[PDB]
Every structure is written in C-alpha cells, then in structure tokens.
Design a protein around this nucleic acid. Structure first.
Ligand SMILES: [Mg+2]
Ligand SMILES: [Mg+2]
Ligand SMILES: [Mg+2]
Ligand SMILES: [Mg+2]
Ligand SMILES: [Mg+2]
Ligand SMILES: [Mg+2]
Ligand SMILES: [Mg+2]
Ligand SMILES: [Mg+2]
Ligand SMILES: [Mg+2]
Ligand SMILES: [Mg+2]
Ligand SMILES: [Mg+2]
Ligand SMILES: [Mg+2]
Ligand SMILES: [Mg+2]
Ligand SMILES: [Mg+2]
Ligand SMILES: [Mg+2]
Ligand SMILES: [Mg+2]
Ligand SMILES: [Mg+2]
Ligand SMILES: [Mg+2]
Ligand SMILES: [Mg+2]
Ligand SMILES: [Mg+2]
Ligand SMILES: [Mg+2]
Ligand SMILES: [Mg+2]
Ligand SMILES: [Mg+2]
Ligand SMILES: [Mg+2]
Ligand SMILES: [Mg+2]
Ligand SMILES: [Mg+2]
Ligand SMILES: [Mg+2]
Ligand SMILES: [Mg+2]
Ligand SMILES: [Mg+2]
Ligand SMILES: [Mg+2]
Ligand SMILES: [Mg+2]
Ligand SMILES: [Mg+2]
Ligand SMILES: [Mg+2]
Ligand SMILES: [Mg+2]
Ligand SMILES: [Mg+2]
Ligand SMILES: [Mg+2]
Ligand SMILES: [Mg+2]
Ligand SMILES: [Zn+2]
Lengths: 70, 58
RNA sequence: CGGCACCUUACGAGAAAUCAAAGUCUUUGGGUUCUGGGGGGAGUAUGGUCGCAAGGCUGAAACUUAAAGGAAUUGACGGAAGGGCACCACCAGGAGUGGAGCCUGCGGCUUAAUUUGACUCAACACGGGGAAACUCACCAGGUCCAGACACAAUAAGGAUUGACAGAUUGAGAGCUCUUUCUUGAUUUUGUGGGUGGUGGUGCAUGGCCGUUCUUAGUUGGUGGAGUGAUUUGUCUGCUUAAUUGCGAUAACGAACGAGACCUUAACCUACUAAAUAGUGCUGCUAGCAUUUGCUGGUAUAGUCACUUCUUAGAGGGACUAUCGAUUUCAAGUCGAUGGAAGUUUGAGGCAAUAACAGGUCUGUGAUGCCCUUAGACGUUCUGGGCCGCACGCGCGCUACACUGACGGAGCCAGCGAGUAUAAGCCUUGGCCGAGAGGUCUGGGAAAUCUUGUGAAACUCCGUCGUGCUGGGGAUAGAGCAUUGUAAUUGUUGCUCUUCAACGAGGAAUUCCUAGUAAGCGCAAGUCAUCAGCUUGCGUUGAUUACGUCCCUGCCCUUUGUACACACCG
C-alpha cells in the first residue's frame, strides 16, 4: 500500500580478496636447501603445520582458529 | 450415515465434493438395527378353532 | 307473444380469459356492408376537400427494427385486504441501558505508524483480537537467502564462506570499510525456472460458519383438473410449540423437516459393588458431667459390618395416569387426586427443500489469477505503534446509601485444572513480613494432594446518624514487592496520602415467565504477568401474565403487476 523509498545509499556485500598464489609468500626455497616456514605457522593444537599467521600490524592472526598474539 | 469431503484441485479453482452415504440399518451390526420411530407390529396369531371343554391327558 | 337481463351446463367453440353465442367453422359455402396483414416512422409529410378557427375526412414514403403484442402459470414485490405466531412483539410487571466516573470496542481527529475486517436486525468485550518483546500484518532502521534444478560464464596458478584488531553501527551484525589469514568446488554472475508472501481480489473459489430459520416448511407415487406451464393432495373451521392433530374433503396412501432420537438434571432404603466415598460398630484414646452419658482424635490391619448418603452400569418409573367439567363429544383444553416428576417433566445437541454477491483467501503445506520476489510486500534483529485525544455512539463495571457503610464474630457450594532434568504445573505445612510477598520441606500425573477450593452476598453484635457523611473511590504524590531479557507511556499486587462527578437519571430503548429475572461470588479459556471479557458453575431468590394482535418482524391466503438481474425492478 506504500512505496518503500530509501534514504541511505545502497550497500555492496563484501567480496573475497583474491591473492595470486598466496602459498608462495609463506615459504622461501633455498637452492640446494629446504623449506623456510617463514610466516610462523600457528601453534594451536586445532591447526598444526601449514596453517600460518597473518603478519599484519601489531598482531599475528590465523584464520583457522581466531586468535592473535602481541 | 458416513460422510467424506475432499477438495479437488482444478486449473480454475477448487472443486469441493461431498459424498453422503446412508447405509441400510438392517445390516448394522453394532448399533441399532432400525430407525427410532420404526414400529414393527407382529401379525395376528388368532383365528384358531376352539373346542368346547375336553381334557388332553399327556 | 315481444323486450332488458340473469343462473347452471358445455353438446359445441376458443390461445385462454371466457362465450346460448364468440355454437351449427379442414365434416371448411344462408344473404350482405365495412375493416386488418409484424413493431415503429405515423394518423406524420404532401395534395385534395369541408370548417370562421380549433380542427375533421382522405392519406403516404424514405428510413429503422426482432420482436412488439394477447391470454394464462409460478415466483418476487406493493406506501392493497384478511388471518396467524413470537417477551430477538406487545399487555401486567421486574431488572435495567440511555444521566455520573471508569473499563473496553467503533467512528472521528491526530500520527512516522496510530495495521486491519465488519456498519440495522445478522458491524461496535466480535475475528476466541485481555497487543511491553514475540504475536505484528503498521512505522524508523539493520541482517540473511532458507534464489531448489538444467544451463552458460568464472573457477584449483583457487569459484567462494567464515573471520581477530581499529573505524563504522543502536548493536561483541566481518553489515561495510582498513586487515592479510583461513576454507576448498557444497559454491560467485547472467538465462530460464522457481519459491515465499497477515500483499490484492470472499464481487474469481473450496471448506467452515451465519442468515432466511429453528420459524414450520418441502416433496414425489397413483387418482382428479388443465392443450399446457402448472394445480389438487399441501384446506373453510377448531386445536397444537409445531403442515400437529381432529375434522371438512377429488383425493388416497406416503417421505423429509417437526416429533421421535441423543446428552444432561430430577426419583429409586429395588439390584451391583467400593481402604481413591461415607456411616455404624469395634480396638486404643482424649476432654465435660460423673448415669452407663455427650462431643472428639486415631485405626491403608479392628486383615470388622453395611451401602442411607457418595460414585457409576444395568434396569424400573410418566403414558397427561385416574376423576370432574367444557369441545363438532373429536383432536384437545382447563381443574382437581395420586405422584419425585403432569409448563413438549426442565435444559440443550442434531436439524429439511432450495439459496445469499452475508463473513472470512488475517486459521490452514485450502486455493485460481494479479502484484512483489534480493536495497524483498520473503525471513530475522533493534526501537516505537496498535493505548495515541477538542468529540458522537455501543457492550459493561462501580455507585448515588440506613433494605447502608465500616469493625469484629458466625460460616455454607458447584463446575473444573494441575509436573520431571523440566526450562518448570496445582501447591498445603512450618518460619519471617502490616501487607503484597519471601524462604525450607512434602503431597499430587490426581474421587487420594492443592481442596470441605472454610467464595461472596448472607446472619449476629457494635460504631456511624441523613452530612456529598464513616456513601462513592476516580485523579494524583511518595514508597515497598512480584512476572519477565526488558515494566518508561505507572503489567500487576501492597502501604500511606490525595476525596472528583454522582444525591436514582430526558427523548428513547434492552432482556425476561420459575429455582426464571435479579443480585452474589467461584473455576476454565486466553495466560511469564494482567479479567471491569467470554464459557460454565453453584449461593440467595422474587414481582407480574399465563393473554392478545394494539406496535414490530416473519409466515400464510386473497389480490394487482408493464417486475423475473425479480422494487437495489
Ligand atoms: Mg376445445
Ligand atoms: Mg354464461
Ligand atoms: Mg352475452
Ligand atoms: Mg404494419
Ligand atoms: Mg399480460
Ligand atoms: Mg403460522
Ligand atoms: Mg411494558
Ligand atoms: Mg446498574
Ligand atoms: Mg480511523
Ligand atoms: Mg485506531
Ligand atoms: Mg486492540
Ligand atoms: Mg508473523
Ligand atoms: Mg518487530
Ligand atoms: Mg519495516
Ligand atoms: Mg460471499
Ligand atoms: Mg397427475
Ligand atoms: Mg391430462
Ligand atoms: Mg397452502
Ligand atoms: Mg401446491
Ligand atoms: Mg388447515
Ligand atoms: Mg444407594
Ligand atoms: Mg401431588
Ligand atoms: Mg425439548
Ligand atoms: Mg461482499
Ligand atoms: Mg456481544
Ligand atoms: Mg459486614
Ligand atoms: Mg514439590
Ligand atoms: Mg465441593
Ligand atoms: Mg468508602
Ligand atoms: Mg466524603
Ligand atoms: Mg496487556
Ligand atoms: Mg484467568
Ligand atoms: Mg476478549
Ligand atoms: Mg403466548
Ligand atoms: Mg399486527
Ligand atoms: Mg399473480
Ligand atoms: Mg422481462
Ligand atoms: Zn590457527
């Protein structure tokens, strides 16, 4: 019976931030060497090796188990 | 009397059908076997011949 | 003999109404004059003729149209007549409502929205609609897809989902934005197709319900009448709650509806039993007079008795029984007597033939179509509204006092409901508290416990003393608790204080005939809380008819009709 008119501008749902070959940045391969494991993989018992933190500012976050350090 | 109503789904609307069936009370096996106001009078058993005054010794 | 007519019948005529002519007419011919050829245009135009004129007589066509019309039938309607029934009509009355305050519903006004349906009976304490959240459909904002499935695009070198921390937000919604982590082909975009809607249409429907109407009405077989549609049966009268019966009778004999029927209430010292009912006895036990008595308590072992009450199943009992009057001596009615019951014994449930633009798509995973469908009219979260207030109206509750208010004391019902690992049911008893309420245990899934629901009116003894008074308790202030996440726009309860109109109500108008009306409370429903509401239940318990058609509605008969979509014609 009424025409719904909006006041706030239309919102856009968040889109997943694609990163091309993210796994390359987690490792530094040495010539005649081995894995680097440079991102400080999470130590929580839920997510073992291969699950890495996010070296963002003033904290290190891992998406599997939501916890932060320093 | 037993009754059954169903809705019939047609392309223009709904068709409602009611099927009322009255069973013969003479065949009823659990309730009354006749209508309440059905009075069944017996037949006259009279019109025998009466003989004056004997005694039949058995 | 001639007239003016009339009554009966229909040989006969007619489409019928009807007709002694409108008969002697397809079995068609006694004589003769005039007139008509579907409805309109139209008795019009034109010409003629008569007339002082008004007009008369004669009198077309173009064009237009599928009916117009006659008689009768059924129904509907009538500001036509005659009957009948009904406390949703009246008479005699009772209680009222309408006058006051308040509760609640409706309109209106207002609003950000104050969601909406309904408008005489048959809208307005109705949608079981007593809305804090939810309900919720409205308003201001914020999320999610819970968009199946075939495709196409994208896509592992990752299609996409969740997300700490800060900003943002009403929000500890990763809603979004900074932030780089995580998950891994379920999934992201477009196409179709969907799906979901308290969105629209009840004037597109089903189902249900209401209404006509719970009034008493409806129908066919055979026979009679009519060319037929139809009609009689189905009715003048009396009678009944009743188309229910008597009776009259071209009808006879039937069916549905009414009545029968079913549930409930009243009776049963007559059956059947009852420690989930009661009693008398008996044990044991208490108090008072001592007369051996009178009141109690206790007894799931006194391992008693019984069914009077209580419970419920099998029956019995009433059928107007008997007797008087009236009556068509019939149906019945009115009086008595007996009886538990003599108003259909009281009350309900069910309830015909068709039908309504009655109400609901806001009960349905009942539905067709239209609208919307991702910035949703879907769903969810937050807050507000449904309560909003110059007004008119309706359903009700308190009152206006002494046939009463308080204060003590007496102290009697019936219908019901009740839980578990819940999301908390009914809750006694003890202890706190002025209260409301709090706390600790126990009983009850129930004739066992709540509960004898020790309810209220009511009755007794006191104060008050005709005063807006100790009637009335609105409005408002402060405080104390309860329910709930949440009480602000007071949920509700309790304490103190505040002490309003109202001094019996105009025109009008509602309900009602016996355990009825009126008071008076109680339970169940809604329900976390809230009952001035409904659905029932019991306590106290009348006045006045037991009649009529004067008003009102409906039904029937006669009657008129140019209506039949039926007078909203
Ligand atoms: Mg004839
Ligand atoms: Mg005649
Ligand atoms: Mg004549
Ligand atoms: Mg003609
Ligand atoms: Mg006619
Ligand atoms: Mg009548
Ligand atoms: Mg009167
Ligand atoms: Mg009153
Ligand atoms: Mg309004
Ligand atoms: Mg309103
Ligand atoms: Mg309301
Ligand atoms: Mg809803
Ligand atoms: Mg809401
Ligand atoms: Mg909204
Ligand atoms: Mg309708
Ligand atoms: Mg016949
Ligand atoms: Mg015939
Ligand atoms: Mg008749
Ligand atoms: Mg008839
Ligand atoms: Mg009659
Ligand atoms: Mg007995
Ligand atoms: Mg007697
Ligand atoms: Mg009865
Ligand atoms: Mg309508
Ligand atoms: Mg009402
Ligand atoms: Mg008193
Ligand atoms: Mg307990
Ligand atoms: Mg009792
Ligand atoms: Mg007082
Ligand atoms: Mg006073
Ligand atoms: Mg409320
Ligand atoms: Mg209640
Ligand atoms: Mg209500
Ligand atoms: Mg009467
Ligand atoms: Mg009258
Ligand atoms: Mg007629
Ligand atoms: Mg017509
Ligand atoms: Zn981790």
């Amino acid at each position: 019976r009424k025409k719904k008119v909006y006041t706030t501008p239309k919102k856009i749902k968040h889109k997943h931030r694609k990163h091309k070959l993210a796994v390359l940045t987690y490792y530094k391969v040495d010539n005649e060497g081995n894995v680097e494991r440079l991102r400080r993989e999470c130590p929580a018992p839920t997510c073992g090796a291969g699950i890495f933190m996010a070296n963002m500012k003033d904290r290190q976050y891992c998406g599997k188990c939501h916890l932060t350090l320093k | 009397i037993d009754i059954a109503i169903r809705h019939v789904l047609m392309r223009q609307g709904v068709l409602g059908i009611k099927v009322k069936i009255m069973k013969d009370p003479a065949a009823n096996r659990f309730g009354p076997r006749a209508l309440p106001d059905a009075v069944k009078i017996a037949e006259a058993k009279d019109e025998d011949e009466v003989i004056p005054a004997p005694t039949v010794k058995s």
